[PDB]
């Protein structure tokens, strides 16, 4: 099985965290520190390309050297031999200590304004910092919003193998569905459906499938908020749900800017013009 194997004789894995289709996130213990650890385990097939595992190094090292409180640290990376399953890619990273968002939103349904502005704001600063460094995190959800004690909020799991190439649709954005390359702006997008659903106590598309969700998200545009909302808030979130990434903030920090002023009591700045390439 994997439950024991030490990964390049370090990170023994433990117990199952997520399943995924990049591969699995265990709970590993490393030999080295003697902490516990969260690895992601990546599957055989995308290991076999060499066009990946070259891209994959060069994404893990980026993000690796990101240090901010915001974001849940990737310590290492590398690959190791499994008997009987090949070399396998695996990444190592910070097992963080709080509730994810999707949890929270379970049990209260629809977040105070005040709670909701705060977190989008956070989320915001934190993914511009990735933004920044030429990082995009390509599946931003509540499920990787995780909340600490304190109030503090921590970015999880960023898409490094969708780099080197229901639940993801729900919260897909219009260009990552037609199959265009994610931008900064697709985790403004995705951080906006994550917004409709903290504000309003209900996501913006639904239905049996996911494709049938994927292709909501492409074609119809979002159902109006409730009326009882402030129409500043309700503009914000509407603005960054735009079809069109480039009529949308550029990356994380205009948009916490933009919460930051509603947060004041001021209209959202619109988006700064797109410039030509």
Known sequence: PRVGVTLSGRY????????????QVWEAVDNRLGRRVAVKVLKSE?????????????????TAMLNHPGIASVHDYGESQMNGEGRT???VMELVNGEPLNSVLKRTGRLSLR??????????????????????????????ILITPTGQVKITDFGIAKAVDMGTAQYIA????????ASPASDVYSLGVVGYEAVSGKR?????????????????????????????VRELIEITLVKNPAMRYRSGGPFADA???????????????????
């Open 89 to 91: 890619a695996y990444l």
């Open 204 to 232: 913006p598309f639904a239905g049996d499938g996911a494709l049938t969700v994927a292709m909501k998200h492409i074609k119809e545009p979002p159902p109006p908020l409730p009326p009882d909302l402030p129409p500043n």
């Open 115 to 144: 709670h909701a502005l705060d977190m989008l704001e956070q989320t915001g600063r934190a993914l511009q910092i990735a933004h920044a460094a030429g990082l995009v995190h390509r599946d931003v959800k509540p499920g990787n």
């Open 259 to 277: 919460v930051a002023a509603v947060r004041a009591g001021r209209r959202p700045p619109r988006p700064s013009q797109t410039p030509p390439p």
């Open 46 to 62: 995308f290991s076999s390309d060499p066009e990946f595992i070259e891209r994959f190094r060069a994404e893990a090292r980026t």
């Open 174 to 181: 219009p260009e990552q569905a037609l199959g265009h390359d």
């Open 12 to 23: 023994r894995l433990q117990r199952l965290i997520a399943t995924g289709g990049m591969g």
